[PDB]
């Protein structure tokens, strides 16, 4: 069924020096299971179609959650439960209505895959 | 209530907290007592990574519980 | 250097290793101390599954890091 398990519009952020900086580009976050059965959490630049981030994630490696204190209410973090590693994203879906459902789906497919 | 924080070097630190405290607060108490910057702290309880804006009660952490502290600044 | 290996049952084992050690060697140390056969061990660090022929330095694993151990074929 389809290619992606989950996809949604979102921008990424990068650490420049010691500063977390939102990347302004229109992006797509997605989860794909490849034929080796591994689960990939990816970010793709929509304009170029380049997949810039592609992380193999195993169950319980990480949690995707809203960053509450951002006035946008649309920043999410993929937090690696072991280590300090965090990847920040910002929802680019025009309506906020599905933000929490997208987040819920990320967690399901990373932490409970088939 | 007293809780225990076990680090990877076999040191365990005891903290006095309230269930109403946020994870951010806990991290600040650990910085205050052992000097580890909050940005380097990853706190684990019952196989969940604890998030800064939640409280200890959110996770059902009761007196004399042990949290695990992993540092690993950067990310491989 | 000391590293921590966290298992799915909430047990954490401490190991003494060198960055130059291979993943195969680490698995043998875990077998020696907890009895788990290397073929059942899956080691995870910074969301990567560790491969037997690489060394800890390949992955930038520094002192007091925590690796996660998942066992092939988990009960329940």
From Swiss-Prot, chain A:
PTM sites of type Phosphotyrosine: 109
Keywords, in A-Z order: Acetylation, Cytoplasm, Isopeptide bond, Nucleus, Phosphoprotein, Proteasome, Ubl conjugation
Keyword Cytoplasm listed: yes
GO BP: proteasome assembly; proteasome-mediated ubiquitin-dependent protein catabolic process; transcription elongation by RNA polymerase II
Claim: Acetylation is one of the keywords in the record: yes
Localization terms from the record: Cytoplasm; Nucleus
Cross-link entry Glycyl lysine isopeptide (Lys-Gly) (interchain with G-Cter in ubiquitin), positions: 16
Family: Belongs to the ADRM1 family.
Quaternary organization: Component of the 19S proteasome regulatory particle complex. The 26S proteasome consists of a 20S core particle (CP) and two 19S regulatory subunits (RP). Interacts with the proteasomal scaffolding protein PSMD1. Interacts with deubiquitinase UCHL5; this interaction activates the auto-inhibited UCHL5 by deoligomerizing it. Interacts with UBQLN2 and ubiquitin.
Record remark: domains: The Pru (pleckstrin-like receptor for ubiquitin) domain mediates interactions with PSMD1 and ubiquitin. Preferential binding to the proximal subunit of 'Lys-48'-linked diubiquitin allows UCHL5 access to the distal subunit.
Function: Component of the 26S proteasome, a multiprotein complex involved in the ATP-dependent degradation of ubiquitinated proteins. This complex plays a key role in the maintenance of protein homeostasis by removing misfolded or damaged proteins, which could impair cellular functions, and by removing proteins whose functions are no longer required. Therefore, the proteasome participates in numerous cellular processes, including cell cycle progression, apoptosis, or DNA damage repair. Within the complex, functions as a proteasomal ubiquitin receptor.
Official protein name in the record: Proteasomal ubiquitin receptor ADRM1
Gene this protein is translated from: ADRM1
Curated annotation (Swiss-Prot), chains B, C:
Compartmental location: Cytoplasm; Nucleus; Mitochondrion outer membrane
Superkingdom of origin organism: Eukaryota
Cross-link (Glycyl lysine isopeptide (Lys-Gly) (interchain with G-Cter in ubiquitin)) at residue(s): 6, 11, 27, 29, 33, 48, 63
Phosphoserine carried by residues: 65
Residues recorded with modification (Microbial infection) ADP-ribosylthreonine: 66
Domain Ubiquitin-like as annotated: residue spans: 1-76
Topology of the protein relative to the lipid bilayer: Peripheral membrane protein
Impact after mutating residue 72 to G: No effect on ADP-ribosylation
Effect of residue 72 to K: No effect on ADP-ribosylation
Per UniProt, location of the Glycyl lysine isopeptide (Gly-Lys) (interchain with K-? in acceptor proteins) cross-link in this chain: 76
Effect seen on changing residue 74 to G: No effect on ADP-ribosylation
Modified residues (ADP-ribosylglycine): 76
Site keyed Interacts with activating enzyme: positions: 54, 72
PTM statement from Swiss-Prot or TrEMBL: Phosphorylated at Ser-65 by PINK1 during mitophagy. Phosphorylated ubiquitin specifically binds and activates parkin (PRKN), triggering mitophagy. Phosphorylation does not affect E1-mediated E2 charging of ubiquitin but affects discharging of E2 enzymes to form polyubiquitin chains. It also affects deubiquitination by deubiquitinase enzymes such as USP30. Mono-ADP-ribosylated at the C-terminus by PARP9, a component of the PPAR9-DTX3L complex. ADP-ribosylation requires processing by E1 and E2 enzymes and prevents ubiquitin conjugation to substrates such as histones.
Role summary: Exists either covalently attached to another protein, or free (unanchored). When covalently bound, it is conjugated to target proteins via an isopeptide bond either as a monomer (monoubiquitin), a polymer linked via different Lys residues of the ubiquitin (polyubiquitin chains) or a linear polymer linked via the initiator Met of the ubiquitin (linear polyubiquitin chains).
Name used for this protein in its record: Ubiquitin
Section of the entire sequence shown: 1 to 76 of 229
């Amino acid at each position: 069924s389809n290619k992606y398990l989950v996809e949604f519009r979102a921008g990424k952020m990068s650490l420049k020096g010691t500063t977390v900086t939102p990347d302004k580009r229109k992006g797509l976050v997605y989860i794909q299971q490849t034929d080796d059965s591994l689960i990939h959490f990816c970010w793709k630049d929509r304009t170029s179609g380049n997949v810039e981030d592609d992380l193999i994630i195993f169950p319980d490696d990480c949690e995707f959650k809203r960053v509450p204190q951002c006035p946008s209410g649309r920043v999410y973090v993929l937090k690696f439960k072991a280590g300090s590693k965090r990847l920040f994203f910002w929802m680019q879906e025009p309506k906020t209505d599905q933000d929490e459902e997208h987040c819920r789906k990320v967690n399901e497919y990373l932490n409970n895959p088939p | 209530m007293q809780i225990f924080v076990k680090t990877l070097t076999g040191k365990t630190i005891t903290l006095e907290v309230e269930p109403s405290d946020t994870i951010e607060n806990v991290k600040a108490k650990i910085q205050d007592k052992e000097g580890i910057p909050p940005d380097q702290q990853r706190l684990i309880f019952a196989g969940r990574q604890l998030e800064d804006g939640r409280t200890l009660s959110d996770y059902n952490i009761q007196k004399e519980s042990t949290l695990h502290l992993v540092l690993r600044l950067r990310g491989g």
